A paper describes a structure:
The crystal structure of the [name]-3 virion was determined to a resolution of 2.5 Å. Each of the major capsid proteins, [name], [name], and [name], has a β-sandwich fold that consists of eight β-strands, conventionally named B-I, forming the two antiparallel β-sheets containing strands BIDG and CHEF. The [name] protein of [name]-3 contains 72 residues; however, only residues 15 to 38 could be built. The surface of the [name]-3 virion is characterized by the presence of star-shaped plateaus around icosahedral 5-fold axes and depressions located around icosahedral 2-fold axes. In place of a continuous canyon, as seen in enteroviruses, there are five pits around each 5-fold axis in [name]-3. The CD loop of [name] fills the volume that corresponds to the canyon in enteroviruses. The EF loop of [name] (residues 132 to 195), which is by convention named “puff,” is subdivided into two loops, puff A and B, in the [name]-3 virion. Puff B contains a short α helix that has not been observed in other cardioviruses. The most prominent feature on the capsid surface formed by [name] is a finger-like protrusion conventionally named a “knob,” which in [name]-3 contains two β-strands. [name]-3 contains a disulfide bond connecting cys87 and cys89 in the CD loop of [name].
Residue numbers in the entry:
A (entry chain B), B (entry chain B): 1 to 232
C (entry chain A), D (entry chain A): 1 to 82, 89 to 188, 191 to 260
E (entry chain A): 159 to 188, 191 to 210
F (entry chain C): 11 to 268
G (entry chain D), H (entry chain D), I (entry chain D), J (entry chain D): 15 to 38
Amino acid sequence: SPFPVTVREHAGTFFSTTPDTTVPVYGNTISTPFDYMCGEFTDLLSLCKIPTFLGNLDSNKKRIPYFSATNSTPATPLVTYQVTLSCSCMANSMLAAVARNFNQYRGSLNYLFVFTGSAMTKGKFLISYTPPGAGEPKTLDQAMQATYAIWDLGLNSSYNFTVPFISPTHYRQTSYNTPTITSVDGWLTVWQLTPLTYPLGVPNDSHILTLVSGGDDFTLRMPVTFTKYVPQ
Amino acid sequence: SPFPVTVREHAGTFFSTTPDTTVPVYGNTISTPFDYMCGEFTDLLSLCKIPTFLGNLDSNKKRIPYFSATNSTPATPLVTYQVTLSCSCMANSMLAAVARNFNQYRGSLNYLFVFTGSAMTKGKFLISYTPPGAGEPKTLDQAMQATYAIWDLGLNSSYNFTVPFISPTHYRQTSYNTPTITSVDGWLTVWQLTPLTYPLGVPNDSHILTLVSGGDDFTLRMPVTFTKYVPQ
Amino acid sequence: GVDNAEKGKVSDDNASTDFVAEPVKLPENQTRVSFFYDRSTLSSVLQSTSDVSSKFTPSTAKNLQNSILLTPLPSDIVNNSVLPEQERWISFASPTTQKPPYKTKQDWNFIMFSPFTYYKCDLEVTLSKNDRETISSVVRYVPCGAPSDLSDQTMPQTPSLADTRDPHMWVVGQGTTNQISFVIPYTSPLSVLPSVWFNGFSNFDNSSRFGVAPNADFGRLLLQGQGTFSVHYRYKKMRVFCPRPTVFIPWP
Amino acid sequence: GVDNAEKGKVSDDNASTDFVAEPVKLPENQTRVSFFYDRSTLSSVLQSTSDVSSKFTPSTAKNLQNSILLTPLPSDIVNNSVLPEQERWISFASPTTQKPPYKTKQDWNFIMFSPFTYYKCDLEVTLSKNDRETISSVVRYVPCGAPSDLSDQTMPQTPSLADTRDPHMWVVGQGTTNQISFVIPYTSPLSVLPSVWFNGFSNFDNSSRFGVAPNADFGRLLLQGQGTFSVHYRYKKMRVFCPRPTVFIPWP
Amino acid sequence: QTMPQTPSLADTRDPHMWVVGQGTTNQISFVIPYTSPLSVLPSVWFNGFS
Amino acid sequence: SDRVSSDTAGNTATNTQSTVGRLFGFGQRHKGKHPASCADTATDKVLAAERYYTIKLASWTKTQESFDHIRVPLPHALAGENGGVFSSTLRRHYLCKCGWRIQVQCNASQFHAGSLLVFMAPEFDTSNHSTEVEPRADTAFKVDANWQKHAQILTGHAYVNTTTKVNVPLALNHQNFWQWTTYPHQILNLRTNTTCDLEVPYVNVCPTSSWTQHANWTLVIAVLTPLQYSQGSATTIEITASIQPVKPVFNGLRHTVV
Amino acid sequence: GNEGVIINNYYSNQYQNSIDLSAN
Amino acid sequence: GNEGVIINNYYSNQYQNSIDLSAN
Amino acid sequence: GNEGVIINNYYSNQYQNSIDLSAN
Amino acid sequence: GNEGVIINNYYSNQYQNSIDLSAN
């Protein structure tokens, strides 16, 4: 006999994210075999962990994947990156590209620096991560009072620096209208501890490539659409 | 094959209190961990049992959390509270605040009195609960003919008085348009048995704090919305 | 019997303590927090004058926006904000009357009765069209703190709100029943939400509006299509923490 | 600590490597490719001005055809093609504004975020009428690369699109809810589809439009009946291969 | 009304129903439990005052 | 008798001879566990910070009425120089998580009358209400210098000018003091005790606090019954408090705040 | 609270409800 | 991914979904 | 009385019907 | 006669059909 039904108040509604399927109109069809394929990946996090380039500003305000250093120790940081997946600095990194499609993140961030100067060039940098609350570090004295690692040049070319996940909340926002304590987490500044030093016949300026990616315990969640824009 | 259905006469109706759920549009989402939290409570009754302040009238018709007593024994009660969770007297107590959102109650009521006079002040009060039927008690002779307890001042500062649940019905209304035998249950009056007595150098007036709450076997039921009002 | 309130707590007695009586307790559980709040209450109203196939544009008309901030607490356009933000106080809609309606949106039942400092729950939202004219609307749900994406249409004659991967609903036709309902999970980056006040600022230069917590909501609802729609909230798996005072009521 | 990026890969560290810290990993799986793409996103729009009982005839009106090419990539009439073909670039609809809408059809969310070279999946299509007027439409689904069959009616007053064994849908009446949804299997003769670019030609005399792969779609949708309909795509059992760059975003 | 253009009857936690649209069938039905504080209700007369 | 109680904390110790016991808010204590929201290993078990910090609060006179009160924002009340090592460590850390062990003191005599309500409240508005000005970093978390009246908070206090106030019936910083007794508390009844002992765990909207922006806990002393005494009795009646941060844990070491 | 249906929920528990998890 | 229904699919797996097959 | 359905009630017995209880 | 449904009748047999009874 027919079953009595109570039509809910949302009849006919199309839920773009309902966790259910719809009617198949061309079933019993074989999906063209692709067993020969390679390169498949199943988690978008894989992408977030691939170190990608940061956009630094050239002397002519042009965007370049590195910063310069020479035979001197500035009283100010060579570069300053605000730790937000919203930083214009990492706007075109795979990390940010993926994060733009998610609401929150959690975990470590890896800032990879690759020294491209000559083999004869030496020097030491102090990479610091300053948590918020007391503002951006104004001096080396302040920067070294927070989380930091000293990078010494030599045989190995790069330094993998991790910005520890230090937050009042378990998750942090990927973007924001105005900075809040849940969307902005401090700064990463790299200072010149000792001047880049070298012999004669070597260009005064050395270029350090800069990249970012999510660390080992980095995660993103809540799929969303980012603010649309016109390509150019 | 498709199932025959009989669409009930209430199709499309939105039942605000249907005991069923609706469609999830963003599932497989983790609720931000909060295991570190404390202070959680699961029953609103917990609140009803917390003794909260009664609003007594000041000589200038101002509302105060206590009443006065001195070296004399008035022929009339110092205070009179009609036992109704609707009493203007307990209007701002947590008990009444919660009860306003429920239809009926049942069980004991606790009226807590705290003597705030000096340590040198002594005295005895007769707290009486008069069930209805013969009207409010006009004299001490009448008051002591109903349920009562004699409160003697001393080392212990407060007296926890219980208004027994005496009713023709198992449950009683929380509010009413006009008083009925199921919404009004008598009066609680506190009399001065012996005058407050004290030595020289002590202020003549002593203040007794007054509070209410549901007793050990107190319960409320049937969630409802109280008569709205404009805050001020 | 005697006791000492200064201790911070006194016993919960019944008639048997002082008198010749018996406990009279009867089982009851309609006072449980989860049960009490697990029911739909009017909490907001929405209005749109633009069609489905058009670009969504934030608008206000007699105190009604075409988007909503999902929170039981008072919300409204604050200091010319693009979209509704959480308010810190309630105001009358009329500058004269000194009587409601209020210009701010909220679950009156929640505001008038929220004897706790923090709360945790999922949100069941119900959206209903205020008249019987056949519905034709598109609603976009944006998780707590996520981008609003108030962009242009990328294709002609399409509802811009549907141009997203965000959860969105589309109801239209004479077969429908002019309403929409769904449930969303708690999405705030906060562990628990402040139910009344937040004694602090939301930014590092402490310039925000003191009293409002950062990202203390369940997201937002943007709507396009003709009509005025009322909104209900139902608190699923409701959990509350730290008992606190209820809104004061004028002395009778 | 130190490393050498020239190797082609460096370790994924957490705070414990260089400092006195602990891993802080929490389980999460909303980043899985299958889950991420398993949701409906606006991907196309369709428009028809001819009735159901008539002969279907390819038409364009202000950049809207009455047929669609099922592919998340940009598609549109290319060099006066009879039906929409896959494009190689996106153009603004307006010759002046320099602002969207675009004249080309696509899943903006897919184009803006497709960090892979190839993909495999089934397609859940949703078709919605842009207004509340009672629907009366017939849609014909044509498998990838199959004959379009834009023939005359074989019988008077019948929808020519329904005159086929191809999967077709017919919705009409006040009992309906002005929409259609269904899922089709991957039908391309290719094992996997190119998600962005195809570095080659599709014919043996290499005269085709370089950059477009042969039969890289899920078929087409032809529609007849009055109205404008928006289309959504939902990628079922989505699988992706070979990571690649995302669309560049202007520097803030 | 506490908010403009909203049904005041729905502005409650009390059980309420809302039906509207051409998909509906112009009726409402539901069942409520006995809620009186009385054990049993008088079917005809009540020989007394309230 | 059994009312003599001593409590040690680091190099400090409180003593009372009229205690009515210690009340544990929510029946919980801060155990000092590190916040799971921080990867850096927290700095904790700092003996020099796990002690009682004693400060004078206010003078109680006959002019105070029921519900007039004094507020003590936490941890801010101790973020100054007098906060010792708790302060100096706090100022150099982004986050702090802790509970509170408190004893408020106030003696009079067997001939004085009156009572106070001593309680701890989370998310209790500590902003200035004697103005329509927006609360700022240096005016929102300060220990009250004067007794606060009660009328202006029943329905809250909007930071808007007096004429607008008319169309604003309720503000979210409202405090129905008639129910202030629902907060973990104790009563200081002059005839009974001269001290109140409370302790509350850590509660907040998140695992640990960015204290520079938030004073999650507030110690409040409100009069319940006005002070009374006859000619000849001591007229100076003062209120004091010993505040101890319970097992504070710090994360996000950085340069100090100014 | 207000769960009065005999048959199990049609949607998974992980989808119908927010997933509760302890960070410790 | 986004499969949160308790009861099994009403349509066969071979009809609801494309049939995956290996050519080797 | 007038209970002629084979399959059990969709709503719990405690919700579909008033809960009968004895005070003794 | 014309009873071709697999699943049992939703309504009780005593309600769906007239109750046949013998007076002897």
